[PDB]
Structures are given as C-alpha cells and as structure tokens.
C-alpha cells in the first residue's frame, strides 16, 4: 500500500522525484513513504562520503526508469530532488509500483 503521488510532480522536462536517503545500507532499495516531506524513503548502500550515494541513488533510478536521472536538488543533503528527464508521472508511478 505504498502511494507515491505526494512525492512525484510532472514538469515542462519531465518528472520531479523527491527522495529522502538513509546511506550506510545493505541494499539500495525503495523501503517506505515519507508523508511529513512527501518524500519516498530510498535506502542507498553506500557511505554518505565522497559522492558516493549520489553516484549510486542515480544509478538505481537511471536503471528503474529507463531514462536519464540528475539530481536537481539536495547534491549534499538526504533530501534530494531527482529529475526524469522525457518521462510522464503515469510512467514513473508504474516503474515505482513494481
Ligand atoms: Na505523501
């Protein structure tokens, strides 16, 4: 029962992702919904040091949707705004929905 429709915008460029990153993990992997930020809670299994969870959380995405991902937002804070470049919300919310 996870709804992402509070963490996801659709724009001019494609779509806004809104993440919030717990680093150190075992696994990247999707794990909740932040509903107090509106944000889709991602565990990174990498060291919050260096890029390094940066590096992975677009790796993650960039192979989940199919399309390029940037960070527009939060480059050094646990909450980023990742962009989707070409992609409609429908597309996204599938994709997340697996
Ligand atoms: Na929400």
Redesign the pocket.
């Given at each position: 029962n996870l709804?992402f429709?509070?963490?996801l915008r659709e724009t001019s460029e494609g779509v806004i992702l809104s993440v919030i990153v717990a680093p150190n993990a075992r696994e990247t992997k999707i794990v909740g919904?932040?509903?107090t930020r509106?944000r889709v809670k991602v565990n990174v299994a990498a060291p919050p040091v260096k890029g390094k969870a940066n590096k992975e959380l677009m790796k993650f995405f960039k192979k989940l949707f199919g399309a390029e991902v940037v960070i527009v937002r939060g480059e050094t804070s646990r909450e980023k705004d990742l962009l989707i470049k070409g992609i409609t919300k429908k597309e996204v919310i599938e994709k997340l929905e697996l």
């Open positions: 709804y429709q509070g963490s919904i932040d509903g509106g």
